């Protein structure tokens, strides 16, 4: 297959953020890592001044600013999710800004199990080494001897396999590492001394001590305090050896501290951010001993206020704090000495859009002008909302809960949105905050006799699921229908069935209990939104979870656990089973094109079924026999089937004489997107390339996949090969390595996919670069103008 | 959350490829039974089964019928194709099989004083290595595809380099008067090997010390297996419970027992299960397949995590695919059992029993 992939909207979620003197020794810089993008801003008193953005051939998993001796300004260490490590310097000569790679190399190990807690990257305060935790039982050390041509990275064995967190201690003669780990006894904090000469670990300055059962964060307090702060779920402790200081502030009991940042350079104040957007200040009181060093007296935690759910925090200047968020919009807030009428010391200054995570989306023509618009379910928890995107203008409709599915009814002029809100079983389940499902003009509650014939507790967070009918013009929540207790709504479709001239909202729901591996009960509920009221037209009970549903030529095609079922809408308004297909583990995703059905499985890739009108049954037309974990499937056309798998890869299969080979779906295209694709849809935001498929990912990235002809694909592949030899990659990563299909099982180069971002970068290069890129290319000898026209035509698609 | 809908929601919300391993681990942890399936195509007892390296895409099996069959697990499960019979058959029972690092070749040996190196891509015999007695063990060096170890009944553990086959001079790593029953390279340290001997127990050997074993754990051992990281040894003994050793301790870290388990009348094999090898699998003479969980806190572990029933005769070989959390077991009967936490076409049983 021949396909073309571009990004209509670059990733918006903030994966990391650091502050330091990167562009110059004088100005203060904020560096934000957004998956593959790296944004450099200069912190001025007028706000944030963007100074640069660089694309990265990799997912930035670690980003640390450090400055060894002899450097005028900080260097930047980046490790990618594919284990490309690089040390970068920012040089600005005249009016030309460029990022120079000072060091680069791959630190992947042939063997090793990636850690459950993830990749950890730390740098010694004196810049003696870089410590990486990539696999259980090993700790990689990269020496930082600049007067050398080779940085010899080596592994050191860890007696503790499950390390929770790790930092480098301050004010140590030899590089000391303090980490919280777990063993059958519980969680412990321990310290080692990293010996480069012997390449090993020696006894730490202070002995291990038992920490909280849920201790998860380690903070290395700078001088003069020294030591470490262990933050868990119920208490905050401070360790410096003979000195131990614990506090148990009740305020932090209602959530988990997830991020931290150091405000004062001497460690006096820290900013802490938890999972529900609360911002705290951790204080460290000091006492000056007589003719001696200062020592900690106490720890005080005060609730600064409420922000967006922070993935990371960074204090910029004059009380300004940047809150980088994954599940909501990023933010610049101000810390005020005096609280407001609500007792909040945080006032929002600026907000930065974040469409991620895009869990579902639809393409609708609301203005009826022939140009499509994308309505996406973005965010989660209080940060969840609807995003309306047009040609790139974005409008936000806050929901204050998690939206799951969205489907548009043109006849009713409305949207049906499945939403979820967290509630506490405070005696039933009361609330957590006002949201869309609780502030609807009208509301209703499910009254179903089924499932009446599973324990609870006083404190338990439970999901309450609602179907919201939302007007398409004002986007007000016209109606909210609440489903049964412990019932999760997983799928939502809007269609007309059979000979019935009415348009319905069909919801598939599963009875979810934490103790069960898979649901044993579920419902398909058909509502009709008529004259402002949402009545339950029909209700069908199924023995499983209705993961997906589509309309199949006037019939309902549902996925109940591992079965793909086809129902028909009877004259008496009742779904009747027509046929079943059982050869699945779990049919998560369903698509359709005529009589063909593309079934996505949890771990067995894609399957192609065909409905037999003359036989009234299914048949397995083809199956893809490479087992990979699927997140989304799409039918590009009758022949090609696109799919996305959980390791950030896209693959295109084809319906390939002997009957055995005809029943195999050959993976004719492979690509490493670097994004977790949640949703696929057919449509375009604008009105060589045939077709148009928009996909939405977890990082708030919207991408476009189209089909190419053989000649166009050949020309663009030649252009890619010629560009890779001209475009200077940041970190010196090979584009071929970056785009290679990567999985824990197998790794292969990309085939049948054109990186449209690389192609569109061809317009931004200098004229000499353009001319030497197109040299002896293909026919009439192509010049720069022809390829410029081709690339502009390609760009016109989005 | 143990339910799968919670896992799907979390994965779609965070999009990290680390919730999959947690989901599969938690699914296996809560199982009280496994989905059962059969594989047909062998005319006699199956004596050797091996999953292909780096994914378990293929399953190479061999036994009394003298044929080396190569099952495509995905296609075989859906009953789409029949096993590929590699060209080149043994003259007697096949006792051991092995892949190389890449699954580009297959070593097969046993009972005919011969080890045949096949090419799986074209299913053609590539090489032959003669032995003085029946071969029971085959291990391929994890670093070098051209180096492989073999244990024979005469009591010799030899190291062959196929790269210099025509001038056959096997390097004898060990020589004892008793029959060596198992040999395995260390997955992370190729210079270290583990050998199971009929009258000398379990031994740890160095490739640079061709006569003195580094360590002697404990003596009668029929099978010894390293874990994925090569820091533990699981050993099966002629009339004793399975025993787990640390690579350095020399003393039994654990022993595993359960009511009804017995290992006396057939040469069996064991394996580790789970993503971090926290499970012990072993067949028994009562036709059941026992699965224990290695205690996290360190000596007899009584009570199996699972007692998988369904085999009509003694269970000898057990192998585990961690990418799919699949179990392939074989024994005297000519059918190969498949046990999965997930449903497969034409299964039996469930996850609750």
């Amino acid at each position: 297959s021949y396909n073309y992939v571009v990004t209509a909207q670059k990733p918006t979620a903030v994966n990391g953020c650091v502050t330091g003197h990167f562009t110059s020794a004088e100005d203060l810089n904020l560096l934000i890592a957004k998956n593959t993008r790296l944004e450099i801003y200069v912190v001025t008193a007028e706000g944030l001044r963007p100074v640069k953005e660089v694309g990265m051939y990799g997912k930035i998993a670690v980003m640390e600013l450090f400055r060894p001796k002899g450097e005028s300004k900080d260097l930047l260490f980046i490790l990618t999710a594919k284990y490309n490590a690089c040390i970068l310097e920012y040089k600005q000569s005249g009016e030309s800004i460029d990022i120079i790679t000072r060091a680069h190399g791959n630190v992947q190990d042939r063997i090793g199990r990636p850690s459950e807690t993830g990749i950890i990257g730390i740098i010694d305060p004196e810049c003696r080494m870089i410590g990486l935790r990539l696999y259980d039982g090993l700790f990689k050390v990269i020496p930082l001897d600049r007067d050398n041509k080779e940085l010899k990275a080596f592994n050191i064995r860890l007696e503790e396999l499950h390390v929770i967190d790790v930092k480098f201690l301050y004010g140590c003669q030899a590089p000391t590492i303090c980490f919280v780990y777990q063993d059958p006894q519980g969680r412990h904090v321990k310290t080692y001394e990293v010996s480069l000469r012997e390449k090993e670990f020696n006894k730490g300055p202070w002995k291990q001590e038992n920490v909280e059962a849920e201790a998860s964060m380690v903070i290395a307090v700078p001088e003069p305090f020294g030591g470490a702060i262990i933050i868990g779920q119920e208490s905050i402790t401070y360790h410096n050896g003979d000195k131990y200081l614990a506090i148990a502030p009740p305020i932090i009991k209602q959530s988990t501290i997830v991020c931290h940042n150091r405000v004062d350079p001497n460690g006096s104040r820290y900013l802490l951010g938890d999972m529900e957007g609360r911002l705290f200040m951790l204080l460290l009181e000091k006492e000056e001993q007589m003719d001696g060093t200062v020592t900690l007296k106490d720890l005080r935690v005060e609730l600064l206020g409420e922000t967006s759910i922070a993935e990371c925090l960074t204090y910029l200047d004059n009380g300004v704090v940047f809150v980088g968020s994954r599940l909501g919009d990023s933010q610049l807030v101000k810390l005020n000495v005096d609280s407001n009428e609500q007792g909040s010391y945080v006032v929002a200054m600026e907000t930065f859009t974040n469409l991620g995570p895009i869990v579902d989306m639809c393409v609708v023509d609301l203005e009826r002008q022939g140009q499509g618009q994308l309505v996406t379910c973005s965010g989660a928890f209080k940060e969840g909302s609807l995003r309306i995107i047009r040609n790139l203008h974005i409008r936000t409709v806050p929901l204050y809960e998690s939206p799951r599915k969205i489907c548009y009814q043109e006849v009713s002029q409305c949207f049906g949105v499945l939403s979820s809100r967290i509630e506490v079983q405070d005696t039933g389940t009361t609330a957590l905050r006002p949201s869309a499902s609780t502030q609807a003009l009208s509301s209703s509650v499910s009254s179903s006799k089924l499932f009446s014939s599973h324990e609870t507790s006083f404190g338990e967070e439970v999901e309450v699921h609602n179907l919201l009918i939302i007007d398409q013009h004002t986007f007000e929540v016209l109606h909210a229908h609440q489903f049964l207790q412990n019932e999760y709504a997983l799928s939502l479709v809007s269609c007309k069935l059979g000979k019935d001239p009415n348009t319905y909202f069909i919801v598939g729901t599963a009875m979810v209990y934490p103790e069960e591996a898979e649901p044993k009960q579920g419902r398909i509920v058909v509502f009709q939104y008529s004259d402002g009221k949402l009545q339950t037209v029909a209700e069908k009970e199924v023995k499983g979870a209705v993961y997906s549903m589509v309309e199949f030529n006037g019939k309902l095609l549902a996925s109940i656990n591992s079965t793909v079922r086809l129902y028909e809408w009877t004259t008496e308004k009742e779904l009747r089973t027509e046929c079943n297909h059982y050869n699945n583990i779990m049919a998560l995703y369903l698509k359709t094109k005529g009589d063909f059905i593309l079934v996505g499985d949890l771990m067995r890739s894609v399957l192609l079924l065909a409905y037999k009108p003359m036989e009234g049954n299914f048949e397995e037309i083809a199956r893809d026999f490479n087992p990979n974990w699927m997140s989304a499937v799409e039918i590009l056309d009758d022949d090609n089937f696109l799919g996305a798998e959980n390791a950030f890869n896209l693959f295109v299969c084809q319906k390939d004489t002997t009957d055995e080979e005809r029943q195999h779906l050959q993976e004719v295209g492979l690509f490493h997107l670097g994004e977790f694709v949640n949703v696929f849809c057919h449509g375009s935001l604008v009105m060589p390339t045939q077709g148009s498929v928009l996909f939405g990912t977890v990082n708030g990235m919207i991408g476009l996949v189209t089909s190419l002809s053989e000649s166009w694909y050949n020309l663009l592949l030649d252009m890619q090969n010629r560009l890779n030899k001209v475009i200077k990659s940041v970190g010196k990563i090979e584009h071929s390595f970056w785009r290679s299909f990567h999985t824990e099982r197998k790794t292969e180069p990309a085939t049948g996919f054109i990186d449209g971002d690389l192609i569109e970068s061809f317009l931004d290069i200098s004229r000499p670069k353009m001319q030497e890129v197109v040299a002896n290319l293909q026919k009439r000898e192509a010049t720069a103008d022809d390829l410029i026209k081709v690339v502009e035509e390609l760009t016109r698609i989005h | 959350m143990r339910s799968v809908v919670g896992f799907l929601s979390q994965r779609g919300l965070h999009g990290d490829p680390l919730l999959t391993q947690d989901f599969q681990r938690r699914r296996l942890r809560g199982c009280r039974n496994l989905y059962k399936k059969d594989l047909l195509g062998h005319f006699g007892c199956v004596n050797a089964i091996e999953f292909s390296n780096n994914g378990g895409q293929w399953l190479v099996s061999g036994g009394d019928d003298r044929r080396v069959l190569l099952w495509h697990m995905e296609q075989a499960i859906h009953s789409r194709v029949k096993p590929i019979q590699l060209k080149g058959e043994h003259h007697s029972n096949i006792f051991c099989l092995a892949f190389n690092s890449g699954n580009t070749k297959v070593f097969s040996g046993g009972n005919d004083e011969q080890v045949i190196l096949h090419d799986v891509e074209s299913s053609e015999t590539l090489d032959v290595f003669a032995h003085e007695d029946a071969v029971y063990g085959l291990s391929v060096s994890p670093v070098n595809d051209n180096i492989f170890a073999s244990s024979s009944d005469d009591g010799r553990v030899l190291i062959w380099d196929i790269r210099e086959s025509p001038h056959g001079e096997p390097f004898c790593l060990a020589n004892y008067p008793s029959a060596f029953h198992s040999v395995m390279f260390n997955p992370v340290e190729p210079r270290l090997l583990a050998t199971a001997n009929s009258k000398e127990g379990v031994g740890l050997w160095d490739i640079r010390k061709p006569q003195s074993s580094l360590l002697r754990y404990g003596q009668s051992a029929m099978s010894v297996r390293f874990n994925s990281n090569g820091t533990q040894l699981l050993a099966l003994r002629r009339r004793l419970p399975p025993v787990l050793y640390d690579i350095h301790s020399r003393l039994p870290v654990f022993q595993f027992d359960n009511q009804g388990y017995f290992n006396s009348c057939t040469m069996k094999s064991c394996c580790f299960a789970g993503d971090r090898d926290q499970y012990i699998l072993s067949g028994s003479d009562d036709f059941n397949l026992y699965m224990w969980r290695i205690p996290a806190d360190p000596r007899v572990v009584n009570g199996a995590f699972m007692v998988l029933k369904g085999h009509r005769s003694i269970v000898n070989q057990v192998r585990f695919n961690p990418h799919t959390y699949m179990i392939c077991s074989s024994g005297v009967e000519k059918i190969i059992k498949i046990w999965s936490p997930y449903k497969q076409p034409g299964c039996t049983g469930d996850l609750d029993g």
């Binding site: 490590a85 000072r102 190399g105 940085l151 | 270290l192 350095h248």
Partner: peptide, 26 residues
């Protein structure tokens, strides 16, 4: 790039075994 990062191969398991067996000489 003025430097490259190469992970030199080391014998973690053998070093651990040698240290453990030399430690048990009391």
């Amino acid at each position: 790039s003025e430097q490259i990062i190469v992970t030199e191969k080391t014998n973690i398991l053998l070093r651990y075994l040698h240290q453990q067996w030399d430690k048990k000489n009391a």
